């Protein structure tokens, strides 16, 4: 029993974290094989970030301008290239701790673990979701740029995020491992604002199933709803629309608990229009939306890595 | 900016997780140097669950009764001993991935990371606090026994917990790495109940300082309180009494935010009286008590 926000074990990723320095800027890099990936803004000064021409700044750099440190060993940069908002530093040494890995771009609503790093050293691991507005509500300080988001599929690490910046509201923006930003953000010190965030509906439903598996069943009701009536209500409360794909993905949890997806949707519809009434679900007074249906199955069934 | 429940990176601990089998029972073990630590209840059959005599059961076992597996390699048990509720299996191979480590016993209110494992394989990592009733509110399934609780100080893993059992309320009980249970619990199927849980007051205060550091100020007020008046109010909401030690420990956060501890204590009194009124503090509608003052300083600085 019990339900916790749970990150993937971070060991396979910790063995890839290195420190990358360019001039006065020091951030984190991900060392996989003989390439170190890091945000391209590591080559920027204070003036540069205001309006940077990254192609021009990178051409002016040499391999000896980049200092890469893996533990107490300095790696020598033998090449440098840029792929979108990510800098790729070719090193002379393949990372002997390179796990089986893949670069994946995630969709909003999907969850992943973040290994927050400072000076190439892992300091914490937490689980978050890519918000529907493409930001992540992370916990990052100065020096955390380059920290990565990942999932673990069997024995394969799927890198899905790299940290680039903090928006004025304290939320975070970053790219996939190919340097493509999640969301309408740019890597420049300029006024940027995330769109109004919405609740990840399929994740709330999955979390309601997790509560039922754990015996917390007060919110269950006799009612069911059509997917259209549910979406009309949910949209008014800034909840993401639930698609037939989401209903299908919630199928195994529906069969395990005996509560059809549209039956749980009528529980959610009531919770939205009326609140919790002083009650809690899994010790929470708010509906939790950072557990996907897969996360709930994995945690309530004990899948290992 | 931002505030998250954050676990320590689990790599140094993952390289220590092994699978321990004794008869039909399979659980996890912690492989450090040439010793594998695991719950001694791994040696129990169905008949030895209500009233096991562990000294008698262990004497009847031989090294070949224990099967230890580290990845795909079977380790050979060359010795076995018991220290309180933990079983120590001497192996003929020192763990090459043994980190710098230490065994620490923690106090209620202290936080740590749990690396939940099944069959010697790490499946997830989460953050916990030792509850004032000495239980932990973990997330564990059958087979999680031997999963460990830890903190990391620079390059050193301080092991503070080993999972042994689930109580009838779904909360968890375990021991330090010397086999001493936290709380009045025993490794027996006999009727056991945790005492009524209470809120870790010093941790709520630390979390209110974390919110202020992150720009939340709505719960602040112009009142201050005596420590005695605060404890009289807090006790009525099942909150732990705040001692002078707790006030002193909150000193650095008090100096960083410019809000004295007893000033923050009056904010906490008001939140307990009014509730949140549809507002949240750091995205939460309830007062969070699983962040110590040390955690808040670590994460914010
Ligand atoms: N010392 C001890 C001890 C005494 C009685 C029984 C046990 C076994 C025990 O409590 N296992 C479990 C742990 N953690 C989670 C569990 C979820 C479901 C079912 C069992 C779970 C251990
Ligand atoms: Cl599924």
Curated annotation (Swiss-Prot), chain A:
Active-site positions on this chain: 41, 145
Domain Peptidase C30: 1-305
Catalytic reaction equation(s): TSAVLQ-|-SGFRK-NH2 and SGVTFQ-|-GKFKK the two peptides corresponding to the two self-cleavage sites of the SARS 3C-like proteinase are the two most reactive peptide substrates. The enzyme exhibits a strong preference for substrates containing Gln at P1 position and Leu at P2 position
Effect caused by changing residue 142 to A: Does not affect ability to cleave and inactivate human TRMT1
Subcellular localization(s) per the UniProt record: Host cytoplasm; Host Golgi apparatus; Host nucleus
Any coiled-coil regions, as ranges: none
Function: Cleaves the C-terminus of replicase polyprotein at 11 sites. Recognizes substrates containing the core sequence [ILMVF]-Q-|-[SGACN]. Cleaves and inactivates human TRMT1, preventing tRNA guanine(26)-dimethylation of tRNAs. May cleave human NLRP1 in lung epithelial cells, thereby activating the NLRP1 inflammasome pathway. May cleave human GSDMD, triggering alternative GSDME-mediated epithelial cell death upon activation of the NLRP1 inflammasome, which may enhance the release interleukins 1B, 6, 16 and 18. Also able to bind an ADP-ribose-1''-phosphate (ADRP).
Subunit structure and binding partners: 3CL-PRO exists as monomer and homodimer. Only the homodimer shows catalytic activity. Interacts with host FBXO22; this interaction promotes the proteasomal degradation of nsp5.
Name of the protein described by the UniProt record: 3C-like proteinase nsp5
Source organism (scientific name): Severe acute respiratory syndrome coronavirus 2 (2019-nCoV)
Record lineage: Viruses, Riboviria, Orthornavirae, Pisuviricota, Pisoniviricetes
Range within the parent protein: 3264 to 3568 of 7096
UniProtKB/Swiss-Prot annotation, chain B:
UniProt topological domain (Cytoplasmic) ranges: 1-301
Cross-link annotation Glycyl lysine isopeptide (Lys-Gly) (interchain with G-Cter in ubiquitin), location: 5, 90
Consequence when changing residue 90 to R: In strain: Beta/B.1.351
Substitution effect: residue 189 to A: Does not affect ability to cleave and inactivate human TRMT1
Compartment(s): Host cytoplasm; Host Golgi apparatus; Host nucleus
Catalytic activity, as annotated: TSAVLQ-|-SGFRK-NH2 and SGVTFQ-|-GKFKK the two peptides corresponding to the two self-cleavage sites of the SARS 3C-like proteinase are the two most reactive peptide substrates. The enzyme exhibits a strong preference for substrates containing Gln at P1 position and Leu at P2 position
Active site: 41, 145
Effect of residue 145 to A: Complete loss of 3C-like proteinase nsp5 cleavage
Regulation of protein activity: Inhibited by pyridone-containing alpha-ketoamides compounds 13a and 13b. In turn, alpha-ketoamide 13b (tert-butyl (1-((S)-1-(((S)-4-(benzylamino)-3,4-dioxo-1-((S)-2-oxopyrrolidin-3-yl)butan-2-yl)amino)-3-cyclopropyl-1-oxopropan-2-yl)-2-oxo-1,2-dihydropyridin-3-yl)carbamate) inhibits SARS-CoV-2 replication in human lung cells. Inhibited ex vivo by michael acceptor inhibitor N3. Inhibited ex vivo by compound 11a and 11b.
Residues annotated as domain Peptidase C30: 1-301
Assembly with partners or alone: 3CL-PRO exists as monomer and homodimer. Only the homodimer shows catalytic activity. Interacts with host FBXO22; this interaction promotes the proteasomal degradation of nsp5.
UniProt function note: Cleaves the C-terminus of replicase polyprotein at 11 sites. Recognizes substrates containing the core sequence [ILMVF]-Q-|-[SGACN]. Cleaves and inactivates human TRMT1, preventing tRNA guanine(26)-dimethylation of tRNAs. May cleave human NLRP1 in lung epithelial cells, thereby activating the NLRP1 inflammasome pathway. May cleave human GSDMD, triggering alternative GSDME-mediated epithelial cell death upon activation of the NLRP1 inflammasome, which may enhance the release interleukins 1B, 6, 16 and 18. Also able to bind an ADP-ribose-1''-phosphate (ADRP).
Protein name: 3C-like proteinase nsp5
Organism: Severe acute respiratory syndrome coronavirus 2
Gene label: rep
């Amino acid at each position: 029993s019990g339900f916790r926000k749970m990150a993937f074990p971070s060991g396979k990723v910790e063995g890839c974290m290195v420190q990358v320095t360019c001039g006065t800027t020091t951030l984190n890099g991900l060392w996989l094989d003989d390439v170190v990936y890091c945000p391209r803004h590591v080559i920027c000064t204070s003036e540069d970030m205001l309006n940077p021409n990254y192609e021009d700044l990178l051409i002016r750099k040499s391999n000896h301008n980049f200092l890469v440190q893996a533990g107490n060993v300095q790696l020598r940069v033998i090449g440098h290239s840029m792929q979108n908002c990510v800098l790729k530093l070719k090193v002379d040494t393949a990372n002997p701790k390179t796990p089986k890995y893949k670069f994946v771009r995630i969709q909003p609503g999907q969850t992943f673990s973040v290994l927050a790093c400072y000076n190439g050293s892992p300091s914490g691991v937490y689980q978050c979701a890519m918000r529907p507005n493409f930001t992540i509500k992370g916990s990052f300080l100065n020096g955390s740029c380059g920290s990565v988001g990942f999932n673990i599929d069997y024995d394969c690490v799927s890198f899905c995020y790299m940290h680039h910046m903090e928006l004025p509201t304290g939320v975070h923006a970053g790219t996939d491992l190919e340097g493509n930003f999640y969301g309408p953000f740019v890597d420049r010190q300029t006024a940027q604002a995330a769109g109004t965030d919405t609740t990840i509906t399929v994740n709330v439903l999955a979390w309601l199933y997790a509560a039922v598996i754990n015996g917390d069943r007060w919110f269950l009701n006799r009612f069911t709803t059509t997917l259209n009536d549910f979406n009309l209500v949910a949209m008014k409360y800034n909840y993401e629309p639930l698609t037939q794909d989401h209903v299908d993905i919630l199928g195994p949890l529906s069969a395990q608990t005996g509560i059809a997806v549209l039956d749980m949707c009528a529980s959610l519809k009531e919770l939205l229009q009326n609140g919790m009434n002083g009650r809690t679900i899994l010790g929470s007074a708010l509906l939790e939306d950072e557990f996907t249906p897969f996360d709930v199955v994995r945690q309530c069934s004990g899948v290992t890595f």
